[PDB]
Amino acid sequence: MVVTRIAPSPTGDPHVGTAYIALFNYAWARRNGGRFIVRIEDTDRARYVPGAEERILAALKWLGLSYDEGPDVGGPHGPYRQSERLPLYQKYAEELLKRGWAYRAFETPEELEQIRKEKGGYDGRARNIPPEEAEERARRGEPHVIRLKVPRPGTTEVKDELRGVVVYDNQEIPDVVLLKSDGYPTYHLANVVDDHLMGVTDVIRAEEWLVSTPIHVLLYRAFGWEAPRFYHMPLLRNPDKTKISKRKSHTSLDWYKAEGFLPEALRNYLCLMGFSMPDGREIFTLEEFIQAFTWERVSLGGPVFDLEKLRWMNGKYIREVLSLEEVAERVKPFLREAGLSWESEAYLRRAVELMRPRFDTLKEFPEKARYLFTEDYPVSEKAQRKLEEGLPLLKELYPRLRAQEEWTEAALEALLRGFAAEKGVKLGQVAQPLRAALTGSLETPGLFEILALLGKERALRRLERALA
Numbered sequence: 205m206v207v208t209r210i211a212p213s214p215t216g217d218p219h220v221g222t223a224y225i226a227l228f229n230y231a232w233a234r235r236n237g238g239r240f241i242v243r244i245e246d247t248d249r250a251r252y253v254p255g256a257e258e259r260i261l262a263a264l265k266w267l268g269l270s271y272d273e274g275p276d277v278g279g280p281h282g283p284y285r286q287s288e289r290l291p292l293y294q295k296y297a298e299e300l301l302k303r304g305w306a307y308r309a310f311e312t313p314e315e316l317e318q319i320r321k322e323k324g325g326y327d328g329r330a331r332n333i334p335p336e337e338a339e340e341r342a343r344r345g346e347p348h349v350i351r352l353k354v355p356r357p358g359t360t361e362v363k364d365e366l367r368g369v370v371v372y373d374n375q376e377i378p379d380v381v382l383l384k385s386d387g388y389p390t391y392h393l394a395n396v397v398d399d400h401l402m403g404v405t406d407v408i409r410a411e412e413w414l415v416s417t418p419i420h421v422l423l424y425r426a427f428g429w430e431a432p433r434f435y436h437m438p439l440l441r442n443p444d445k446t447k448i449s450k451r452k453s454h455t456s457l458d459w460y461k462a463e464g465f466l467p468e469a470l471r472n473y474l475c476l477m478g479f480s481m482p483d484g485r486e487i488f489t490l491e492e493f494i495q496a497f498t499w500e501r502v503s504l505g506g507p508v509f510d511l512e513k514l515r516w517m518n519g520k521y522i523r524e525v526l527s528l529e530e531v532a533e534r535v536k537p538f539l540r541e542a543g544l545s546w547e548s549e550a551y552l553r554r555a556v557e558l559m560r561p562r563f564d565t566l567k568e569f570p571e572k573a574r575y576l577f578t579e580d581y582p583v584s585e586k587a588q589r590k591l592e593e594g595l596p597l598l599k600e601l602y603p604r605l606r607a608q609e610e611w612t613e614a615a616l617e618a619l620l621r622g623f624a625a626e627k628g629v630k631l632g633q634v635a636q637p638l639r640a641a642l643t644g645s646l647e648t649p650g651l652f653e654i655l656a657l658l659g660k661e662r663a664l665r666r667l668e669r670a671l672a
């Protein structure tokens with residue numbers, strides 16, 4: 205049975221790259237009838253951010269990436285936070301020492317810096333300390349790290365399922381620190397001990413880890429454990445092809461959420477990162493992705509995460525995938541956040557229907573349609589100057605609007621049509637000033653549709669304030 209995992213470090217905002225990796229792990233497990241688990245790698249007590257674990261977990265659920273074992277759901281092979289298994293890494297590091305696969309190294313940082321300058325990296329000189337002397341120095345409390353004792357000379361072969369076999373000369377592999385002087389493990393020791401103990405069979409992780417894999421293969425060999433399959437995902441990129449960064453791309457999943465990106469749309473977009481549908485279809489469900497998933501269609505080029513294409517997809521979901529009523533339910537949290545209320549559901553629905561063709565994110569709806577929910581809307585400068593320029597026409601028009609009995613979109617259009625001809629002007633010269641007066645904007649949906657929406661008295665009662 206296939207077992208995959210996502211292994212986030214709670215050191216910041218939930219990263220979009222974690223969702224990208226999580227998605228493929230979830231998909232590979234589900235397509236195979238297996239399990240997808242969550243392991244929190246939270247040993248960097250220095251970078252630990254309170255609430256960061258919860259936000260990443262919430263973010264995966266927000267996107268529909270349910271997991272089967274984890275810190276909150278529990279599971280048969282926990283604990284699921286590495287901060288809760290510190291004793292296991294120490295004991296496994298001691299086991300490496302006993303097999304001759306690790307050694308204690310006592311160099312101070314000043315020494316390591318001199319050696320790094322002299323040799324280019326740590327040269328393993330502590331391997332020449334008599335083992336009984338190293339044990340005695342450790343026993344007396346001397347500070348030290350436990351390093352991997354790589355076979356010198358030698359070679360190590362690593363198979364990546366998507367990229368093939370790489371043969372490394374052991375000279376390219378340093379005697380990496382496995383256990384730090386504070387008793388905490390390094391990533392190399394913990395990933396191996398935990399993937400093994402949690403039963404992970406398929407390790408799907410970011411490209412950056414690819415070159416660290418021979419260290420891991422050596423560790424599996426050292427413990428006498430069977431290595432899992434390795435799949436290093438193509439690099440997630442900024443539009444300029446550089447490795448995705450917060451300096452040139454929004455990377456926080458909480459940002460996408462707060463901005464009104466629908467989880468289904470963002471999830472669908474992430475599916476297009478390292479994958480393509482056979483027929484080329486770009487809009488599809490999580491289940492369709494799982495049913496279609498195969499490693500044969502994962503491009504290795506490294507996908508560009510494009511905010512423009514994502515906004516386009518969000519828009520397509522808002523006006524072609526969701527129903528009107530569903531879009532209405534979704535903007536509510538955003539209207540509330542903007543401190544706006546709606547008279548009824550019917551009105552709200554109508555307001556969303558009118559605006560639907562004009563917004564690509566849920567947050568843009570309250571921003572662009574504020575004048576529909578509050579009598580105290582903002583008037584842009586550009587709308588104010590158009591309003592001023594056309595005030596006299598509006599002043600003469602006001603009487604016709606008050607006398608207006610038939611308050612329908614079509615009667616109103618005819619009124620203004622009749623009025624402009626009367627005044628010898630084009631309809632637009634009357635229309636735009638009026639739009640500015642009723643909405644504080646020059647860009648809104650159908651002027652006559654809006655005019656009739658609120659209602660005669662409401663509409664009229666708002667036009668008077670423009671004449672002050």
Ligand SMILES: N[C@@H](CCC(=O)O)C(=O)O
Pocket residue numbers: 210211212213245395408409410413
């Ligand atoms: N905790 C690591 C991931 C480790 C792995 O995927 O093997 C990170 O946040 O980069």
